[PDB]
Amino acid sequence: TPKIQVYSRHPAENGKSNFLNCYVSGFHASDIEVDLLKNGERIEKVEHSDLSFSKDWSFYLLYYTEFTPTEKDEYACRVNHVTLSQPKIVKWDR
């Protein structure tokens, strides 16, 4: 299954603007679906940068969006594919 890493650009501070990132990487998988979730809900208009190499069928995806973390709010990265029996959800931990 693809490697999934979830992290903020700068050290996380409540009420301070930051970037949420989900880095998805691996081999032998096309048409991967990636979403960022806020309190279980899909965040719309998330940007992404995609890199792939045919030589080893590798892919490296970065999904990111500007955000301001708080105590009440929980974030995660949701990855889906045909290879997966169910969407793989990875919670963000500061």
Place this chain on the structure above:
Amino acid sequence: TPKIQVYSRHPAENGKSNFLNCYVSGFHASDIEVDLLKNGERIEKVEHSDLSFSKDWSFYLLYYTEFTPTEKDEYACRVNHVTLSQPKIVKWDR
């Protein structure tokens, strides 16, 4: 229409191994088709590296393969898309 640049990795020398590259870049175009041609014929098993950014709908594609240029042989890059009325062919010039 996408920018297309065709070039060898090292200075071209007849009968000397090298890499043929076609660099295709632009904005607002998905599912672009790229082929390298030898004497008008599609070269099979060409590798490629693909990079794209959603922020500006940009793409940067590098199609490459190992080759040995000669006097008799002519090479080109063929790019196609729905946006194009006909495949755009760009001949390699040493």
Place this chain on the structure above:
Amino acid sequence: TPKIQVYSRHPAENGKSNFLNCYVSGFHASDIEVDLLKNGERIEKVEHSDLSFSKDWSFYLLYYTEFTPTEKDEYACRVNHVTLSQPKIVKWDR
């Protein structure tokens, strides 16, 4: 000697914001120096992205700045390198 390409991000339109780029690539960066010029003067607000690989000692540099092209202004890229007898100045061909 290093390869030098000077180009705008989008087709130039006088009076409209754009980015001017100088892409410098080659092997053995050594004492490489790159600057963008306006009417012969160094542009202050220039940033750069640098990529290098020790395997083949290749380097790929992108020097860039936001700019507003006009009919009267001349832009160029100045490059100095050990392999050059004197600094090379490549004019932006609109």
Place this chain on the structure above:
Amino acid sequence: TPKIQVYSRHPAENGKSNFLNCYVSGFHASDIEVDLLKNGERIEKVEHSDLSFSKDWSFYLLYYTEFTPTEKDEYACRVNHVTLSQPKIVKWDR
């Protein structure tokens, strides 16, 4: 201080060829020094890919080597930086 991640390209299998990676990232590279170690000894056949951006002074370094993991051998990455009181050694957790 710089972020340091040590990992193999594919899941480790004893006796099977793989790549060991040390990914070092942060802001203001300055006098950064990176090495891969086997049983405390510097590995000679290490290459690296370096990416940096002047906009935010970010840097992203990938130091890598082909290796054949075994049960007995210990690998690590050594990093020295101005922001570190002494060089940091991060062991590869298989």
